[PDB]
Design a protein around this ligand. Structure first.
Ligand SMILES: CC(C)CN(C[C@@H](O)[C@H](Cc1ccccc1)NC(=O)O[C@H]1CO[C@H]2OCC[C@H]21)S(=O)(=O)c1ccc(N)cc1
Lengths: 99, 99
C-alpha cells in the first residue's frame, strides 16, 4: 500500500493474540504501546518526547503483525497517549517515505 | 526522493531565511520547531506528546521549503527537543508512506 497523510496513518496490529491500532510513525525511533500486557521478562527504560520523558518496559524479540506483515523486535510498553510503530519495526516491513 | 528508515528521516528546511534540520514525522499532526524566531502575531496553544504537553506559539501562513519544495501553513514554535515536520506540511509536499 501507498498511503497519503491527510489522515493519521493508523494501522491494525496483531501482537500477542491481541488486536490494537497504532500510528505508523517515522519520527519515532522505537515502537511504544500503552494498552497491552506482554508476558515474560523485560528491562526498565525511559524515553523522551515532546513533553519530556516516560518510563517504559522494554520487551525484546516481540512478534508483531502490522497490516499483515510480520516483524520481530523491541516493543516498549508504557503510558504513551497513542500507540506508535517506530522505525525499528517500520524498516522490517519495508516501509518508505516518498515525495 | 524515496527515503528508507534505517536512519532518522532528517531534511533541510529553509524558513524565514534561516536553515534548519527537521524530522519528516508521519506521527505528528503539526509542525513544531524549537531553534527559531519568526516575526509577527501568533496565538497561544498547547500540544501533547509522549511525556505530556508543552506550550507553543502558533504562527499561521508560514512559508517553508523542505528539500526545495515549498509549503505554506501553520508552524508551532516551542520547546520541542527535535524539530518536526508534521502532516500539515507533509501533505503539501506530496509525501506518502509506502510498504
Ligand atoms: C507520540 C506521537 C503520536 C506524537 N509525537 C510525534 C512523534 O513522531 C514524536 C516526535 C519526537 C521526536 C523526537 C523527540 C521528541 C518527539 N516521536 C516520539 O515521541 O518518539 C519517541 C518514541 O521513539 C523515540 O524516538 C524519538 C523519541 C522517542 S509528538 O512529537 O509528541 C507531537 C505531538 C503533537 C504534535 N502536534 C506534533 C508532534
Amino acid at each position: 500500500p501507498q498511503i497519503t497523510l491527510w489522515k493519521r496513518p493508523l494501522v491494525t496490529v496483531k501482537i500477542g493474540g491481541q488486536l490494537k491500532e497504532a500510528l505508523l510513525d517515522t519520527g519515532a525511533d522505537d515502537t511504544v504501546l500503552e494498552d497491552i500486557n506482554l508476558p515474560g521478562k523485560w528491562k526498565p527504560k525511559m524515553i523522551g518526547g515532546i513533553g519530556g520523558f516516560i518510563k517504559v518496559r522494554q520487551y525484546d524479540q516481540i512478534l508483531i503483525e502490522i497490516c499483515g506483515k510480520k516483524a520481530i523486535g523491541t516493543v516498549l510498553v508504557g503510558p504513551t497517549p497513542v500507540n506508535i510503530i517506530g522505525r525499528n519495526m517500520l524498516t522490517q516491513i519495508g516501509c518508505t517515505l516518498n515525495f
